[PDB]
Amino acid sequence: PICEVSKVASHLEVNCDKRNLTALPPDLPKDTTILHLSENLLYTFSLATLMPYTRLTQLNLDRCELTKLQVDGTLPVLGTLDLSHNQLQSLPLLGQTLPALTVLDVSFNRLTSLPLGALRGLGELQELYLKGNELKTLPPGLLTPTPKLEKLSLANNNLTELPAGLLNGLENLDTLLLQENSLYTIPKGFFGSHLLPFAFLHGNPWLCNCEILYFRRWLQDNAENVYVWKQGVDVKAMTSNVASVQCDNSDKFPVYKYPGKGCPT
Ligand X SMILES: *[C@H]1O[C@H](CO)[C@@H](O)[C@H](O)[C@H]1NC(C)=O
Which residues make up the interface to Pt ion (CB under 5 A)? 51, 74, 235, 238
**Beta carbon nearer to ligand X, 41 or 48:** 41
Which of ligand X, Pt ion, none binds 238 (CB below 5-8 Å, type-dependent)?
Pt ion
Which of 4, 11, 18, 110 lies at the binding interface for ligand X (CB under 6 A)?
A: 18
Minimum Å gap between C-beta 82 and Pt ion is 20
> Residue 103: which of 146, 65, 157 has the closest Cα?
146
Question: Which residue, 16 or 101, has its beta carbon nearer to ligand X?
Answer: 16
**Residue 19 interacting entry, from ligand X, Pt ion, none, C-beta within 5 to 8 Å by type:** ligand X
Residues 152-171 as x/- pattern, contact with ligand X by CB under 6 A: ------x-------------
Candidates 225, 217, 136, 212; CA nearest to 173 is 225
- CB of 235 vs Pt ion, minimal distance in Å: 5
**Residue whose CB is less far from ligand X, 54 or 89:** 89
Q: How far apart are CB 65 and ligand X at their closest, in Å?
A: 13
**Closest separation in Å from C-beta 229 to Pt ion:** 7
Q: Measuring CA to CA, which residue among 204, 89, 196 is closest to residue 157?
A: 204
Residue 134 binding partner per list Pt ion, ligand X, none, with a CB distance cut-off of 5 to 8 Å that depends on partner kind: ligand X
